[PDB]
Amino acid sequence: EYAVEKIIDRRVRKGMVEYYLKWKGYPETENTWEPENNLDCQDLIQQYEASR
Amino acid sequence: QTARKS
Numbered sequence: 001e002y003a004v005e006k007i008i009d010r011r012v013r014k015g016m017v018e019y020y021l022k023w024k025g026y027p028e029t030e031n032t033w034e035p036e037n038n039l040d041c042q043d044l045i046q047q048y049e050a051s052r
Numbered sequence: 053q054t055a056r057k058s
Binding site for chain 1: 053054055056057058
């Protein structure tokens, strides 16, 4: 539902992969952890795992 | 691209 600027971090919680996201046009204070199923950013995810 | 905000 919102445009993602970049993935900052990744973690596993409750057996779910989650990404810490910086939302485009929003302050860092709005960064939130979102389960991977919530994302439609294959490019960013792909790039994150790559440079990881 | 985009993402759902839980």
